[model samples]
Target: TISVPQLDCPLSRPVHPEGERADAYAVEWLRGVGLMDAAPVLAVGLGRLAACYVDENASWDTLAFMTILLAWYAEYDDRAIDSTLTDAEVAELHRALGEILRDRPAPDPSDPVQRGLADVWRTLNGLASDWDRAAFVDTTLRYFEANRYERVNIRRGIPPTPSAHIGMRRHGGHVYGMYILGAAVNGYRPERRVLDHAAVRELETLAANYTSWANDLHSFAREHRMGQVNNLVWSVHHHEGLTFQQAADRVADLCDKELAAYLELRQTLPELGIPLTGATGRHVRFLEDMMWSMVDWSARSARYDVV
Candidate 1:
């Protein structure tokens, strides 16, 4: 069992109103993606999404559907690609993903993953702007590229600097793009310039780092035992020459620092005279929801228990 020390931070982690719907939708999405084999982990996975994006702005259908997709991706990415897929395999699949995201013709009819991406794209394409769609494609590509890079580095025995690892992990985790997806699900579409604003951009980055670092804490034991060196605890252990507990303590402090920074930036928006209205307002609030939800979910979810 992994004994995780609690980071002291006040967060509003609420449960989504439609838990039953989320569960049913989870099973439905797994079957649709031909990922029925993930049923065992479906509940906790789905539960995480429900707890993470519990805001009532989005309809139950929208929330449940997106939650299912996110949950399914979590399981699939961890089990299928994180350690199991070869570089060549991920590379080829990456190419197919591009085709799907670009709304080009399908690369492989038999690939359920590709099909799943297509399904998501079709829905999002309808709601996103040219800038929004482009951002999604760009961030997603970064995620894949970063993931592949991290995997290669791990295999080659190359350790990244702490800053580089956090940056890579943030992009590779696709937390930013996932935030955009959250915006779409809530029917909140920000103007290109609003999202491009310095403060908003900083908030987004901090939120991603906050969540990704928190995940490193939650999954420390499992990933450590599996030799997944991308974790922050591992990075601290390697770079600082600290023991596991010492490194974990450092990572926890890092998590606290990020949460503090995120909150500070979030509050600074008003002082910066950024109006909390329209799409931009929704975008900011969505990021907050994502942070709170993730922490809340991690606190209770069995998937990260690793006992």
Candidate 2:
């Protein structure tokens, strides 16, 4: 009994032809690492993302690495909150994960999350531009830090204020890594000026903004079942004393607003005094495709329908 707006994307949705092969490659890696039984279905869904987001010209080399890279991080989400592992332990584990990016340690890391990430990072330098690699690593570390922050600050049963919930959710939600994952696979790194601009920073986060809200709507029943109030819909429902369905409608409106902002700012280069040409010009389409792909993939994936 709940529904959200279908996002209006002016750009057409075109998928990469090799997505099926990329999906199989990720599954095989999961099987090799003994995760096939324990595997997160989100891992499988994300491999399909590359086909929708990546350009048709993409090389399989990048496509293969991209799929499993996301698979490991998807696994990282499940492990981050395990009752058995201390917050202290996950902190130590992230340091090791970062070190492996320099050059993997002589002794292979003991944990499978580290093991899979290290395996994926090995090929990142070979395929991605130096800037793309740095962006990916930076966001990976941000996701870890955000997870730690949430662990310390938010009580599971208490609903965070709507503002705080979204602030924490954006960095902690794994959407940042997925944004860069699309860029890295596309193989076009923007100029440092474009990458650093305030406008471009907003562009990068807008898709993650709406996409995270869509996730809240999709998983509302499951969050309620688990007795958790971390989702945005639950925050509104608890804080505003509205019916749960009313809260969902409000959040869906917010989702519409996020994309509306994206559509406007996407066309506003000159007013911001930003120079986006050459490689950066090609990057504009990549950003457009990314937003469209995340929405489409989320609707079709059903991985969120378990409740």
Candidate 3:
């Protein structure tokens, strides 16, 4: 039965939806959100997200779902992405994404291209949102690339140049800025261009710093492990570079110092009462769940919890 769920403005309701997979559910989520005639901006944004999926990148397709799901979790869950919360959150978030896909029509039964188109649309729908959705999607894609850079240089036992792992952590930091910007826009009383060019540029710079520092930290850890490049190992080695006792210390330092400028920017925006980054809070914790799941999949494909 093709049925759309009813909504009460902000609260999302499940639809009869299509596939149980993450990408499929995202499509349904976006489509459902798009139906909010009151927020045409959101609908239009969703349309663009759909277009991205039509191009066929499943990793991104799943990320579109993560952006929204994670954002919600960030605001509500104090420990949104902590290791303790990751497994449960991944299960819940994937279920939400899947439900969205299930409510949509099956991928086109015709040409494989059309079927692919269907796949894209389903996931794209998940990426819809005038503010946070679009930015988060872009940032996460960049993060995906950032991780690739790390894998190639840090994890894969490849030789490292100064630039080898620089971009990866920077991109991770960009995710935080963009997320905060989106949250501020969403909650902000008036929609302002608070997430302006300067903001974006700052985010990029922060990302670079983070990537560079983390790479250096992880380089030593990887050397010690000789092969294993897990987060703990990376943290231990990175902490040795300075006086930090753990990775959390590095994260805390970055948040307070290196990332301080962006943090201030985020705090100021909310002073205007605008919610630029509604999807997620302005912290690294928001990404814990997503990273854990991705790391799990990377380490053991069969262990992936989300379908």
Candidate 4:
């Protein structure tokens, strides 16, 4: 049994005042956290869209559907909306997820996205043995759980009623958005099921910090909600704090790391190019530009005290 914390539950962390708006808090949260803030939501969407292509020509938009669906779940969880589902609704949610997983929607071959999915699916089928498939499924499922676990990350301290409403929210802003870019890459590939096991292993190995990417933003949201200046922001807010150069350096480091992961997925065995590389090609590149714009907004937020 995977002993990880529960997915998207009651207030484990504070919700930003913006979060009270329920629609835009996580948006600002993405900005404050030094992620590609300019068009963070769109970039996330494109990235996820790209990631959805793992089985080349598999006639399945599994990753794309899951990425978008889960992205919404992530945003909802962040906003404290995922917990409200009745037992029946929860069952429905599971059913929808299962349907996508089992049926595997057909991809449009001419579409860049469909091509990408076909490519990746081909790679997976070629390289993945039964064991590999099982492992991949397990890993993907684990990622699904961790990304939205509210009790562990989103709504740890709140009561169940409001928590349910909040729980109903999803992380569509970032999760699905990014996964879309991932799907596009899969859609473009020629070989489905040709993933290199070693690459998958490396991804799993690096998965240690995978959740932290979101956690960093989560921590910032809580601090801002409580009217506290997070240390990351403190660098700009505090007197004698980090110089502009220092702040730039910090965000640059993160960007470098993000790019490195992009490379890892693009270059390695069973390289999941669709999710990471596809974004690198054009869609994600477009989103990267958006991140720069977000940096400007974040900088303004730092100086003007409003986002």
Candidate 5:
């Protein structure tokens, strides 16, 4: 049920030395927020994700804000899996929370997700600039919108083409949003010109695809048993007429190429007249970290093993 490609990841994989501390911190925070129960393997795994982006030089607020956002997204996806909340309900909550982050309507203290999100926006306010903050707001809302798009399209006769999945997976997976939100957390935002460049933009999408595909491969067994149809594994297997195992291998192959090409593309920045100067260099490495850290963290956490 679970098949991983023999990947060639040339990027470094280093966990935060205090990742365990961050893990405990997030689990406690989620528990306090009513987002996690006694057993918090999921929260802890996300906490490790939280630590991956920041260094010892980063502030406690940076770590906590990252932890909070990671848990909130994880919990939001869990609810989106529900019949408990309809599409409208999800959108309404999105509206509410987006407003909260934007600082118009205040967060409902009684609502864990809302208050938690609003709280993080405050942390981001202090940690990031107006540009990064606005970017985060826009991307996060679009992430919610993508969730609705998946549900609506799933409810419809639906569409095709592997390429379409790539677009949806990148946005729907919220990798762009994840990176944008965390972009200014530990360092400066890459110049708008760099981020907007065709190749560098593609770099972010490449990272998005790699992350989403890798997780989809790992998630196949769980999503399979749950009878899900909206995964890359299912998509590839269905569209290509491949067995699940075969589809998993194909996914692995895609990831391998994605990794190699991603590195090659980074090198092409200078050729494209995009200098890998101070901010751009860090941004490239951050994207690299975002891609490679998933492999490192996935190896250590078995949260996806549960049905």
Candidate 6:
């Protein structure tokens, strides 16, 4: 195992009762998507997302379905879409994904991954409200577009400024998009304005940044060896001329700052005036669940154990 400084946060390790079912469905879904070859990399990711459901009593099947969706996204991201897809190919694929999210007829699912995305989109569209569906579509598009930005940066041999990288990483990290699944799993759909409030948006940004940066810390050694461009620590080293150890410490400090901000911002939830009984409240809890979930999952998942 690779050793790194541990960033501490008070996280809840809530267990999902449907945990085994998530694993079983993950394998089946990966095979269904012709991704059985990547099952080892994908299965644990699904379980981690499933375990993050805010309502412990939320529908297991819903959580499991969302897990499959998230796993598919991560698998494709690591396997091909990020590294291999050309700009034109990515644009066309994005169109197909957009069609699914908008409830239009998508191209015939010729590709296995598109088919998988279509399947998940169909299920989620059926379950989500119009507002929620739109929100998810927008969030997912941001993630994909940001990923393309990272790909372009890698190819052009340019590193993003740390601030710019943080903005992109919030989307490219894919956690912002995953939080929508948390809302969907709980059947919560907040109105557009409430969901888009500055405070809520900031909180969401913090969650994504904190988790993705922590993941950078966890995966730095492996990512550095592979010459990956999007890692925060690696970027710090490149852009700031820090030694590896210095970069690692800088990132740890950055992660700590984000964590502190997240904790402080969470207290402002009551001020949002969202009733505890409705979708807005549920969505807030969903964010909280994901914030903790990311920390817990990173520590436990073997995918980050590469030394």
In order, candidate lDDTs are: 0.73, 0.70, 0.37, 0.34, 0.73, 0.71
Rank order (by TM-score, best first)? 5, 1, 6, 2, 3, 4
Give lDDT tens digits, candidate 3, residues 57-106.
Answer: 33443444444443233222222221123445444543443333455543
Report the Cα lDDT for candidate 5.
Answer: 0.73
TM-score to true structure, per model? 0.89, 0.85, 0.34, 0.33, 0.90, 0.87
- Which residue window of length 10 is worst by lDDT in model 5? 152-161
**Residue-wise C-alpha lDDT for candidate 5, range 128-200, written one tens digit per residue:** 6545667666777777777776676556533345777777777787787777766667766677777788998
- Deviation in Å, model 5, residue 267 alpha carbon: 1.6
Candidate 6 structure quality by residue, lDDT tens digits, 1-307: 3358767777665677777667667877778776655556553566656656535676766776667776777676776543455788777777777777777765856777777877787777666644455666787888778878887877766567787887788788767667766655565667776776788788878877777887788777656555567778867888999987888889989888987898788776676674445777666667666666666776677666553
RMSD of every candidate to native, in Å, equals 2.5, 3.1, 16.2, 15.4, 2.4, 2.8
How many clashes in each candidate?
Answer: 0, 0, 42, 117, 0, 0
lDDT of 2 by residue, 95-119 (tens): 8878886675624455676667667
Predicted candidate 4 versus true structure: per-residue lDDT over 4-105, tens digit per residue: 111221112211122113223334433333221344354333222223222323332343333333334444343333333344543344344433444365
What TM-score should be assigned to candidate 4?
A: 0.33
Q: What does the lDDT come to for candidate 4? A: 0.34
| Whole-structure CA lDDT of model 2 | 0.70
Cand. 2 TM to true fold? 0.85
Reference-based TM-score, model 5: 0.90
Estimate, for each residue in 95-206, the C-alpha lDDT of model 1 and write its tens digit: 9888888778679977777777677667656545344667778988898888787787668664678888987898878888888777766666687767778998888888
